């Protein structure tokens, strides 16, 4: 699938930047601009793979000594003239070295998986769910912005 290929290219670029010894890694994975008609399950797979990929990102950045890691994920299935069905998802995460040090992998994986499960449940059920989220821990230098908008006609 296209989502799996995008995830593989992102993995390879992340590993290439790790091997080169970078202290500032900025990974941005954007699903191609498509319509909601046929791509909803593929977008759900894209979100699931990005969620599973951020957990590996955090470990491989902390062990490599990365000083600042930014992971950005974006999917936008736009509505057609016929329906109001739409699926917008944007998740940006910025972690400093202390942030990478203080991340509990278990709680992080649980949070990502619960968020994705709620997204999948809302998308499958044809329900409306819109939420924005901005978090900033200044002491540990952890920040994230998340915007999700799920509409079923
Ligand atoms: Ca609805
Ligand atoms: Ca709105
Ligand atoms: Ca609205």
Experimental determination technique: X-ray
Rounded distance between C-alpha atoms, residue 4 and residue 49, angstroms: 8
Query: Shortest CA distance to 129 belongs to which of 112, 115, 108?
Result: 115
Resolution (A): 2.5
CA 93, 125, 91 angle in degrees (round to 5)? 10
Cα(122) to centroid of ligand 3, in Å?
15
Which ligand sits closest to the CA of 131?
2
For 29, residues 6+ apart whose C-beta sits below 8 A from its C-beta are 6, 7, 10, 50, 53, 72, 73, 74
Domain extent listing, the chain: 2-151
Which ligand sits closest to the CA of 151?
1
3-class DSSP state of 48: helix
């Amino acid at each position: 699938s296209e989502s799996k290929k995008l995830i593989e290219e992102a993995k390879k670029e992340f590993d290439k930047q790790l091997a080169e010894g970078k202290k500032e890694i900025d990974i941005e994975i954007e699903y191609p601009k498509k319509k909601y008609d046929e791509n909803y399950k593929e977008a759900l797979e894209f979100i699931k793979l990005n969620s599973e990929l951020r957990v590996e990102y955090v470990k491989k950045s902390r062990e490599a000594g990365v000083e600042k890691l930014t992971i950005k994920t974006k999917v936008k299935l736009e509505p057609t003239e016929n329906s109001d069905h739409k699926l917008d998802y944007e998740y940006e995460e910025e972690m400093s070295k202390k942030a990478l040090e203080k991340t509990d992998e278990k709680e992080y994986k649980e949070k990502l998986e619960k968020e994705y499960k709620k997204i999948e449940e809302t998308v499958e059920s044809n329900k409306d769910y819109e939420y924005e989220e901005e978090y900033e821990d200044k002491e540990t230098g952890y920040k994230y912005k998340k915007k999700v908008e799920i509409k079923g006609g």
